[PDB]
Amino acid sequence: HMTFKAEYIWIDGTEPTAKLRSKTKIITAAPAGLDALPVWGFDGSSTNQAEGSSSDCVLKPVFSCPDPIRGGEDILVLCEVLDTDMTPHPSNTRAALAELSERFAAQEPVFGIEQEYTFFKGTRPLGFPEGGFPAAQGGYYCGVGSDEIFGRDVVEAHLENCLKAGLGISGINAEVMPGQWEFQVGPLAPLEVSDQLWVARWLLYRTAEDFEVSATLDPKPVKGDWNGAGAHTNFSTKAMREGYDAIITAAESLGEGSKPMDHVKNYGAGIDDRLTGLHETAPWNEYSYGVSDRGASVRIPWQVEKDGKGYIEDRRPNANVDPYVVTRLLVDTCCTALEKAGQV
């Protein structure tokens, strides 16, 4: 049997937005999926999962895939973080989703996440001239040419790495702001879409190291009329894919009670800076939904309304949202209302 490299990847307890951590384990064993991979540990003081004298943390594999960069038999191992007593660590946001995922498995929730990000070279946006601004927006989005496209080599390398890892990438595109890009993950189950997006994020930062650039998931990287970075989330249940009434209930459910504030205060840090009335999308403090409405909080695509079935698009989440969090909330809110409505 063989010796291989295992990259253990986890999420820390940094505030307001948590960060990825990883280290390499050299494993000398007979290959098997996930279940044969050892739990591991690290020092919490260094990752804000203590920054104190009593937290030592345990790494528990939850997802694994091939390491496309290292190649060969090497693998990536996404972990959840546990306390020494094997209970979920307070930073752990996966465990809550797993519970809700299981609770609502009958409805078969499916997600697509459109993850945006912006390239930087140091403090400078990669698409910006030093000490200045590029031409106004219009030619960057879905663009071509050196004048309007920045970081394509990175984006292509990242896309190839994600596919080699087996992640469900449906597309990529260049965004409205120069040096701003998007990739779409899904359609997938709530734990699976969330796990893959974190791994895909890890691949983006990591791939970009070789090109000596940085990527940021900051929602408003440059102040002004320059475009924000979102993480639009597409969501449906079997009933929603079957009929239009479920589609309306889900959209209505998000507008009920404290749910608008409940989601928005968990949809990523600095959300007030990105969600303004004037550009995309709607203000963070009011909820709306509509057909083909890019100004609404939630959009129902024109095809969905025509077909009387489909999915809905939540345009509120920031590019820096935790996928474990956004998926949990939408499943908790929408699926609960659908059960009550009998639209299951």
- Which residues of this chain interact with its own copies, rule CB under 8 A? 3, 5, 14, 19-26, 41-43, 45-48, 51, 53-54, 56, 70, 84, 138-139, 141-147, 149, 152-153, 156, 159, 163, 169-174, 176, 202, 205-206, 208-210, 212-215, 292-295, 302-303
Nearer CB in complex with Na ion: 289/324: 324
Nearer CB in complex with its own copies: 11/330: 11
How many whole angstroms separate alpha carbon 244 and alpha carbon 253?
Answer: 14
CA distances 5 to 21, 37, 165, Å, are 16, 12, 15
What is the number of the residue whose Cβ is closest to Na ion? 145
Nearer CB in complex with its own copies: 104/183: 183
Nearer CB in complex with Na ion: 214/266: 214
DSSP assignment, residue 46? G
- Residue 23 binds: one of its own copies, Na ion, none (C-beta under 5 to 8 A by kind): its own copies
Reply yes or no: is the peptide bond before residue 84 cis, omega within 30 of 0: no
User: Residue 297 contacts by C-beta under 8 Å, 6 or more apart in sequence?
Assistant: 254, 260, 281, 282, 286, 287, 288, 289, 314, 315, 316
- Residue 71 binds: one of Na ion, its own copies, none (C-beta under 5 to 8 A by kind): none
Smallest distance from the beta carbon of 329 to Na ion, in angstroms?
Answer: 23
Cβ(113)–Cβ(171) below 8 Å? no
Site string for Na ion, 136-165 (x = CB under 5 A): ---------x--------------------
Nearer CB in complex with its own copies: 104/198: 198
Smallest distance from the beta carbon of 148 to Na ion, in angstroms?
Answer: 7
Smallest distance from the beta carbon of 2 to its own copies, in angstroms?
Answer: 11
Smallest distance from the beta carbon of 209 to its own copies, in angstroms?
Answer: 5
Site string for Na ion, 171-210 (x = CB under 5 A): ----------------------------------------
Residue with tokens 């990752």: 47
Smallest distance from the beta carbon of 11 to its own copies, in angstroms?
Answer: 11
Q: Following DSSP, what letter does each residue of 256-313 receive, concatenated?
A: STTHHHHHHTTS-TTHHHH--SSSSS--TT---EEET-TTSSEEE-HHHHHHT---EE
Cα dihedral value 30, 33, 36, 37, nearest 10 = 100
Nearer CB in complex with its own copies: 210/256: 210
For residue 217, give the nearest of 11, 79, 14, 17 by alpha carbon. Answer: 17
- Residue 26 binds: one of Na ion, its own copies, none (C-beta under 5 to 8 A by kind): its own copies
Nearer CB in complex with its own copies: 139/243: 139
Smallest distance from the beta carbon of 37 to its own copies, in angstroms?
Answer: 14
How many whole angstroms separate alpha carbon 117 and alpha carbon 78?
Answer: 21
- Residue 15 binds: one of Na ion, its own copies, none (C-beta under 5 to 8 A by kind): none
Strand (E) or helix (H) holding 207: helix 190-210
Strand (E) or helix (H) holding 341: helix 323-341
How many whole angstroms separate alpha carbon 176 and alpha carbon 125?
Answer: 14
For residue 326, give the nearest of 311, 336, 340, 315 by alpha carbon. Answer: 315
Nearer CB in complex with its own copies: 162/335: 162
Smallest distance from the beta carbon of 46 to its own copies, in angstroms?
Answer: 4
Dihedrals phi, psi of 207, to nearest 5 degrees: -65, -40
Binding site for Na ion (CB under 5 A): 145
